[PDB]
């Protein structure tokens, strides 16, 4: 087994997979274009891998190897030298001693911590994960970015309503041109905003909500999407992207309704045909006052629920996501916290 210990050491220290005899317990595909699938071979395992502890150990080793291979592919280096971190791993000599003692678990935890530290340092200093999360919160969550989406809505007021009232045969080329010119005028430094793409869905927001949840339902057929590249796609999956799309569509519906209400109020308060009265009207306090009270109630409902949401859900989640990456330890843990926050938002 001197060969197997060396193979395991290489896999746990560099992520290099060299199994020409199909003996190692893990091997990846591509020996979807950037994300390869890692298959675990249970016929050549070293333990049972049935209990929760053994399953977590195997998952930790596999995650260490995956992170090592991803760092190698990102740095374009054939191997990761030990000087890149303060953690050194010793090669396995006695397989029986390694199996009977906790030295295996110690080495696995050490290499996993080293890989996680290297990955976090790389994605924090070279990729600017803080800027990435700020940009995605500005795009999908509307965090400190309401001005841009409000300007977009005010510029494409007629286009959106005409597309929602017409069928799918209505040409959205004007809306696409507006979106692309806005993206071009946007600063090229914002990679998320420059890669933001727009599209039309055949189903509505309540339709997709009823398709995804256990609820019952041609308006609001617009949505946005981001194509997460490598090696950022191994962290930003597609489920969080779909959650972001749903939250963005909901916020867009809310903002469009508030914009319609604001436009109605501005018309009612600025039109002389509305603000004019006399000639023994006897209809002013009956019609104009009634509709103004109705609009005031609609405002005190919509704006109030929007404030409640954006304060006790959106703001709280933004604060938690901002305080979570303070001295991080696991990128997978950060992703799990983000998914849990999104799940809380959706299940509120």
């Amino acid at each position: 087994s001197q060969d197997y210990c060396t193979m395991l050491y290489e896999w746990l220290t560099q992520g290099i997979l060299n199994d020409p005899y199909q003996e190692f317990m893990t091997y990846d595909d591509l020996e979807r274009a950037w994300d390869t699938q890692y298959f675990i071979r249970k016929d050549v395992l070293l333990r049972d891998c049935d209990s929760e502890e053994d399953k977590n150990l195997l998952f930790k080793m596999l995650r260490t190897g995956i992170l090592l291979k991803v760092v190698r592919a990102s740095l374009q280096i054939p191997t990761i030298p030990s000087n890149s971190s303060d953690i050194t791993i010793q090669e396995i000599n006695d397989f029986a001693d390694l199996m009977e003692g906790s030295n295996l678990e110690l080495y696995v935890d050490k290499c996993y911590s080293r890989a996680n530290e290297i990955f976090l340092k790389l994605f924090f200093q070279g990729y600017d994960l803080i800027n990435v999360l700020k940009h995605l919160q500005q795009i999908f969550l509307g965090y400190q970015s309401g001005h841009n989406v409000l300007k977009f809505l005010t510029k494409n007021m007629g286009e959106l309503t005409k597309h929602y009232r017409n069928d799918n045969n209505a040409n959205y080329d004007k809306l696409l041109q507006n979106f692309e010119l806005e993206r071009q005028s946007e600063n090229p430094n914002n990679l998320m905003r420059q890669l933001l793409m727009i599209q039309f869905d055949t189903e509505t927001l309540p339709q997709v909500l009823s398709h995804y949840l256990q609820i019952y339902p041609a308006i609001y057929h617009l949505k946005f999407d981001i194509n997460i590249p490598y090696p950022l796609n191994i962290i930003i999956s597609r489920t969080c992207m779909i959650k972001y799309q749903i939250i963005l569509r909901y916020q867009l519906v809310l903002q469009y309704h508030s914009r319609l209400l604001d436009e109605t109020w501005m018309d009612l308060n600025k039109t002389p045909s509305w603000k004019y009265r006399g000639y023994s009207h006897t209809v002013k306090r009956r019609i104009v006052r009634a509709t103004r009270v109705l609009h005031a109630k609609m405002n005190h409902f919509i704006k109030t629920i929007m404030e409640y949401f954006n304060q006790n859900v959106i703001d709280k989640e933004v604060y938690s996501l901002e305080k979570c990456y303070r001295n991080p330890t696991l990128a997978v843990a950060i992703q799990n916290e983000l998914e849990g926050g999104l799940t809380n938002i959706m299940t509120n």
Binding site: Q37, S237, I242, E339, T343, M346
Partner: peptide, 29 residues
């Protein structure tokens, strides 16, 4: 047990959404 059933409902919603999102769990030969 109220927080427990709330977390259970959240976990059920998460499982439903993960099963709807392409089913990342797979097995090969």
């Amino acid at each position: 047990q109220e927080v427990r059933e709330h977390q259970m409902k959240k976990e059920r919603f998460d499982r439903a959404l993960e099963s709807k999102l392409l089913g990342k769990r797979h097995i090969t030969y």
